Design an enzyme around this catalytic site. Structure first.
Site, PDB file in Angstrom:
ATOM      1  N   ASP A   1      -0.050  -6.941  -1.662  1.00 23.47           N
ATOM      2  CA  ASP A   1       0.015  -5.527  -1.228  1.00 23.47           C
ATOM      3  C   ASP A   1       1.485  -5.112  -1.263  1.00 23.47           C
ATOM      4  O   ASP A   1       2.231  -5.358  -0.309  1.00 23.47           O
ATOM      5  CB  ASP A   1      -0.542  -5.417   0.228  1.00 23.47           C
ATOM      6  CG  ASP A   1      -0.611  -4.023   0.694  1.00 23.47           C
ATOM      7  OD1 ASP A   1      -0.043  -3.127   0.033  1.00 23.47           O
ATOM      8  OD2 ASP A   1      -1.172  -3.850   1.829  1.00 23.47           O
ATOM      9  N   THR A   2       1.893  -4.467  -2.339  1.00 19.54           N
ATOM     10  CA  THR A   2       3.313  -4.092  -2.457  1.00 19.54           C
ATOM     11  C   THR A   2       3.635  -2.916  -1.554  1.00 19.54           C
ATOM     12  O   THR A   2       4.813  -2.619  -1.344  1.00 19.54           O
ATOM     13  CB  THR A   2       3.693  -3.714  -3.926  1.00 19.54           C
ATOM     14  OG1 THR A   2       2.824  -2.640  -4.398  1.00 19.54           O
ATOM     15  CG2 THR A   2       3.469  -4.917  -4.853  1.00 19.54           C
ATOM     16  N   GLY A   3       2.611  -2.277  -0.952  1.00 22.24           N
ATOM     17  CA  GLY A   3       2.833  -1.229   0.044  1.00 22.24           C
ATOM     18  C   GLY A   3       3.103  -1.797   1.466  1.00 22.24           C
ATOM     19  O   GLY A   3       3.321  -0.992   2.402  1.00 22.24           O
TER      20      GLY A   3
HETATM   21  Y   LIG Z   1      -1.369   0.023   3.220  1.00 17.62           Y
END
Ligand SMILES: [Y+2]
Ligand SMILES: [Y+2]
Lengths: 99, 99
Positions: free
Chosen positions: B25-27
């Protein structure tokens, strides 16, 4: 480009002809911007889930430009803490995770 | 590996010796698992923030393994709808986004 992940991976994006900053977010299925104006018809879409659902406007086949790549994708327009480029737009631009 | 983004990028990970599935998850700034047990010292950490902040346990230098890459990272343990491999762990494995 090849983007390392020591900082949040924000990029400049042109969406429906407007310049914005947005986060490359592999945890997000969809792309969403606040405070852009897109023309034409849309479909309402209920997103989120925490404390209720958020109503946003779904636009199809919107022109998007990132790092010189001009693509078309689905864009949601509605309230968001930051603008998000999700996997829908990432697959259009051909982005992969590599290690 | 090279992971395309047409589906949610879940991978099997071994964390603190326990096998789990988690989202690349790069967020997400941080890595977080629910329902693992880690030994040793922790400190509370306040994370999130929209709606209020969430209290989690922060563990340091936890052994993490993904696709045969053994690294060490900070791991938070607390409530999360899916387990998340955030940027803290992805920089340790050398993951990049590429297009
Ligand atoms: Y997120
Ligand atoms: Y706003």
């Amino acid at each position: 480009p090849q983007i390392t992940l020591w900082k949040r991976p924000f990029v400049t994006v042109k969406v429906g002809g407007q310049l914005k900053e947005a986060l490359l977010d592999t945890g997000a299925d969809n792309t969403i911007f606040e405070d852009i104006n897109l023309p034409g018809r849309w479909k309402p879409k209920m997103v989120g889930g925490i404390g209720g659902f958020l109503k946003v406007r779904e636009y199809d086949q919107v022109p998007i430009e990132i790092a010189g790549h001009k693509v078309i994708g689905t864009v949601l327009v509605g309230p968001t803490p930051v603008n998000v480029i999700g996997r829908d737009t990432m697959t259009q631009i051909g982005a992969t995770l590599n290690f």
